[PDB]
Amino acid sequence: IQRPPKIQVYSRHPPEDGKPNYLNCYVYGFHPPQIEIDLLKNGEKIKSEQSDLSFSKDWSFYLLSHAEFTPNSKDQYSCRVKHVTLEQPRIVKWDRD
Amino acid sequence: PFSFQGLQISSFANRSWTRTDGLAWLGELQPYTWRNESDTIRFLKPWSRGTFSDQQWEQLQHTLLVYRSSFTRDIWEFVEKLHVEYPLEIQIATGCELLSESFLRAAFQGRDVLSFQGMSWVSAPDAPPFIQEVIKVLNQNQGTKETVHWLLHDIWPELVRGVLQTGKSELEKQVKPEAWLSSGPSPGPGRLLLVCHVSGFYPKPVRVMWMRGEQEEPGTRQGDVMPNADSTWYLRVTLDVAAGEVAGLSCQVKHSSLGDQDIILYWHH
Ligand SMILES: CCCCCCCCCCCCC/C=C/[C@@H](O)[C@H](CO[C@@H]1O[C@H](COS(=O)(=O)O)[C@H](O)[C@H](OS(=O)(=O)O)[C@H]1O)NC(=O)CCCCCCCCCCC
Ligand SMILES: *[C@@H]1O[C@H](CO)[C@@H](O[C@@H]2O[C@H](CO)[C@@H](O[C@@H]3O[C@H](CO)[C@@H](O)[C@H](O)[C@@H]3O)[C@H](O)[C@H]2NC(C)=O)[C@H](O)[C@H]1NC(C)=O
Ligand SMILES: *[C@@H]1O[C@H](CO)[C@@H](O[C@@H]2O[C@H](CO)[C@@H](O)[C@H](O)[C@H]2NC(C)=O)[C@H](O)[C@H]1NC(C)=O
């Protein structure tokens, strides 16, 4: 009935400083389906795209956001997610290594 | 191997706000969507049309369209007449595997609620009391039951057969992953976390392992295989190990697109 979301963050391609890449934020296993997902660079939102909402056998929801990004060893990225089951928004950082 | 599956997500916030979106999967590719805004469905692939004629599609469209409006109206009326409280989340899943076996299942507030067996609406064993009223009203409308029967037994199968034929090549493409290694956060004292990333592979079945030469290493933790925007996959596999033992560890990747020629990545220092 109410399932909190699980959040995972990963790049499409091996992160090499300077090469254009894509940052993925996969949010899954949640219910109900209304959810806010933002991709962040040093705190600020960045232009992300988002796939259609879809769902698994047990009826939970899953969804993919991704954003074009160019990593360098300076900047940090994260995924911020808002859902009814969360008292406070949940931030998951992209860990390069 | 490749199942077809049609999905509906309906939400009713209150009596004034509602939305219904749909999509469908064939194996792991998404041929269609029907967004709330659209009066029609999107063919997301050049093979999405299958072998279905234009008149056949138009008919199916219209059927689905009437259904979407009628469905919405019917829920609202079931809510008023049965005093069920908002918000509501309703999910529907149909589809078939050719052996040919069709289903139409429904969930409410995230739990299985009813389905369509044979020619009847049947309540799930676990369903709340009031859906017995729903089932009753639904099993009265003969025309709907006939339209559902016809969809599941006549239309789904003929469709799936066609788009399997036209989507055959894109469905069974093989796409080689790229892969890399990294040093994750320390899991404790003198323990290190070695991470093996594999990304860009399609189809989804993949074996990824830590190793000493030919000896598979257990303590290898699988991550979840998760999607990429381009419908290829990503998988992260880790190992917990002591700083002395770092000697001669390799990650090894088996994938259908590689044949017998696996990808090996070595740790150095
Ligand atoms: C409290 C709620 C919680 C419970 C949640 C579960 C509820 C189950 C959901 C199932 C509800 C299905 C309701 C069916 C809606 C029907 O109104 C429509 C059309 O009804 C037709 O309207 C017709 C008149 O229409 S009008 O001229 O425009 O007014 C006729 O009355 C016709 O009867 S007939 O004897 O003449 O043939 C009648 O059936 N049922 C359908 O359209 C059936 C097709 C179902 C397609 C399912 C596909 C789902 C897959 C999702 C992928 C996008
Ligand atoms: C999902 O789709 C439904 C149905 O397509 C949307 O509801 C519809 O929205 C339209 C246009 O926005 C509404 O039009 C209204 O018409 C009346 C005329 O009497 C007028 O009072 C309003 O000013 C407006 O023009 C219409 O009420 C409504 N249609 C139905 C069948 O409910 C719905 O908003 C979409 N969902 C979301 C979240 O957008
Ligand atoms: C019905 O529900 C919808 C969606 O939940 C409500 O629309 C929102 O209402 C807030 C006010 O709290 C406004 O900021 C916007 O108008 C809407 N936001 C979103 C995210 O939709 C609507 O208020 C509700 N209608 C009634 C009569 O309760």
Numbering used by the authors:
A (entry chain B): 1 to 97
B (entry chain A): 7 to 105, 110 to 279
Provide the authors' own sentences about this structure as they appear in the paper:
To address the question of why boCD1d does not bind bovine brain sulfatides to a measurable degree, we crystallized boCD1d in complex with synthetic C12∶0-di-sulfatide (di-SLF) and determined the crystal structure to a resolution of 2.9 Å. The asymmetric unit of the boCD1d-di-SLF crystal contained two separate boCD1d-boβ2M-di-SLF complexes that are very similar, especially in the presentation of the bound glycolipid. Our structural studies using a short chain C12-di-sulfatide finally revealed that boCD1d has a restricted A’ pocket, which in contrast to mouse and human CD1d, can maximally bind glycolipids with alkyl chain lengths approximating C18. The di-sulfo-galactosyl headgroup of di-SLF is presented in the for β-anomeric glycolipids typical upright orientation, between the α1- and α2 helices and stabilized through an intricate network of H-bonds that involve the core residues of CD1d (Arg79, Asp80, Asn151 and Thr154), as well as the polar moieties of the di-SLF ligand. The 3′-SO4 group contacts Asn151, while the 6′-SO4 group is bound through a water-mediated hydrogen (H) bond to Arg79. The ceramide lipid backbone is oriented inside the binding groove by an H-bond between Thr154 and the N-amide nitrogen, as well as by Asp80 of CD1d binding the 3″-OH group of sphingosine. A total of 6 H-bonds are formed between boCD1d and di-SLF (four with the headgroup and two with the lipid), which gives rise to ordered electron density for the headgroup. Overall, the orientation of di-SLF in the boCD1d binding groove, and the presentation at the opening of the groove is conserved with the presentation of sulfatide by mCD1d. Unambiguous electron density is observed for the galactosyl-di-sulfate headgroup and the C12∶0 fatty acid of di-sulfatide, while in case of C16∶0 -αGalCer, electron density is well defined for the entire lipid backbone but less well ordered for the galactose headgroup.
CD1 is a family of antigen-presenting molecules that is structurally related to major histocompatibility class I (MHC I) molecules, but binds and presents lipids, glycolipids and lipopeptides, rather than peptides. The overall structure of boCD1d is very similar to that of other CD1 or MHC I molecules, in which the boCD1d heavy chain is organized in 3 domains, α1 and α2 that form the central binding groove and α3, which non-covalently associates with boβ2M. The glycolipids are bound in the hydrophobic binding groove that can further be divided into the two main pockets, A and F. While the A pocket binds the acyl chain of each glycolipid, the F pocket binds the sphingosine, leaving the structurally distinct carbohydrate headgroups exposed above the boCD1d binding groove for immune recognition by cognate T cells. Secondly, the conserved disulfide bond in human and mouse CD1d that anchors the α2-helix to the β-sheet platform (Cys166-Cys102) is absent in boCD1d.
